[PDB]
């Protein structure tokens, strides 16, 4: 069992990002059993939820003339636009029915500001609005974060990279993640994470 | 329309503490519509969930020869013993079906250490284990906390009192709360809360 100063952060294991959902990442449901097992290795487990209002600025539907998977320039920089997904209170937003972590101690929703996305569970896309997560973990005596979930190259990568920025020892458990790979995002995410000192590990490194 | 520096904390609006549940507080379902309406006044809304393992020390069932509602002495002081309630993953632990706050931004579970209760969403019964809530709220720029839910004299009172300890301006919205009143606990929880400068308001004051 991992020590009290470690937490597992389970990123967006939601209907919306799994097969059948509005932004389904192929095979993303196959990581769930590994995640359920990993969470049993940990004393401390947080789960995140993309939690968008219908009018969110990340939906291509809210920008005249723009299509899913196009990028647009916002006050805070480049924003990829998406199909509508994980809208607050909808089926798409719920956790995947295979997810089974009764010991989870926190559920932190993100992306709820209409005008600011938040792939990261730690900081919003404006690079300035802090979500509360850093404060929560530090108060609990947590100094080490392992990140799993969906998508590797968006919410997992940005959560991991913000965890580093905020002072956490950060690791990503690769086989408990699944990626989208838009215009080469997946390899770039791995390169950036590795440059910034995120440790790339496999589930077998913890379970055995 | 409350400013960004204020948050509504919704305490344990769960099947377990409402009519039908394992630790049912009479009429406690009746506060839910007011709560739903109040959440609509706030930018920032946090929900709490009592979240006990089956093994939990607060259950009478785990102390042979003790009865629900009797008090025993633990390491950290007095502990009321209860019916089994709000066990992790069970129907009893779930939010009440009438609760409707899609804008809620956090759900914090408490009471999950087998050996330590946690009526308060800020600090556990041992007076020392901090739950993370203080840091989360301070990080978000929140300095004022309004508290609603169940029970007025336990999880609501302790949450409010710990919030004061931690430096928040603290209010409790009386008609959006419901109590248990064990041996005078209700009137006393109000006394203590006011002595400590918790503001007692009514939903109509906010709405
Ligand atoms: O990585 C995610 O979970 C994600 C991807 C696209 C949009 N919103 C969230
Ligand atoms: O106030 C509460 O929610 C409460 C009351 C008794 C036991 N556990 C929690
Ligand atoms: Zn999103
Ligand atoms: Zn309890």
Give how far Cα B107 sits from Cα of A110, A123, A124, B61, B201, Å: 12, 18, 19, 28, 24
> Reduced to 3 states, what is the DSSP secondary structure of residue A148?
strand
d(CA A89, CA A47): 16
Both tokens of residue A194?
Answer: 């590795």
The residue segments making up the domain with residue A179 are: 1-208
B73 touches A: beta carbon within 8 Å: no
d(CA B8, CA B107): 12
Q: What is the dihedral of CA A132, A138, A140, A146, to 10 degrees?
A: 90
**Which residue, among A178, A183, A135, has the nearest Cα to A156 in the 3D structure?**
A178
How many domains, in total, are found in chain A? 1
Minimum Cα–Cα distance from B90: chain A residue: A102
Q: How was this structure determined?
A: X-ray
CB contact under 8 A, B135 and A131: no
Q: Are B108 and B121 in contact (CB under 8 A)?
A: yes
Q: Are B105 and A111 in contact (CB under 8 A)?
A: no
Rg of chain A over CA atoms, in angstroms? 16
Q: Is A84 a catalytic residue?
A: no
CATH number of the domain within which B105 lies? 3.40.50.850
CB contact under 8 A, B130 and A140: yes
Q: Is A119 in the pocket of ligand 1 (CB under 6 A)?
A: yes
Bridging pattern class, strands B44-50 and B6-11 = parallel
Q: Over the range B154-182, which residues count as b (16 or more CB within 10 Å of their CB) and which as e?
A: bbbbbbbbbbbebebbbbbbbbbbbbbee
């Amino acid at each position: 069992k991992q020590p009290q100063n470690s937490a597992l952060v389970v990123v967006d294991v939601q209907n919306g990002f799994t097969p059948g959902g509005n932004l389904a990442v192929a095979d993303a449901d196959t990581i769930i059993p590994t995640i359920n097992q990993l969470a049993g290795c940990f004393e401390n487990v947080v789960l995140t939820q993309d939690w968008h209002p219908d009018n969110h600025i990340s939906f291509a539907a809210n920008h005249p003339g723009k299509q899913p998977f196009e990028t647009i320039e916002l006050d805070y920089g480049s924003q990829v636009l998406w199909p509508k997904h994980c809208i607050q209170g909808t089926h798409d937003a719920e956790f995947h029915p295979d997810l089974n972590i009764p010991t989870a101690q926190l559920i932190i929703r993100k992306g709820f500001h209409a005008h600011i996305d938040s792939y990261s569970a730690f900081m919003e896309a404006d690079h300035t609005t802090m979500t509360g997560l850093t404060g929560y973990l530090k108060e609990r005596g947590i100094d080490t974060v392992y990140v799993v979930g969906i998508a590797t190259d968006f919410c997992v990568a940005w959560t991991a990279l913000d965890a580093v920025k905020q002072g956490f020892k950060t690791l990503v458990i690769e086989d408990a993640c699944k990626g989208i790979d838009l215009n080469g995002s997946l390899e770039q995410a791995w390169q950036t994470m590795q440059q910034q000192g995120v440790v790339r590990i496999q589930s077998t490194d913890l379970l055995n």
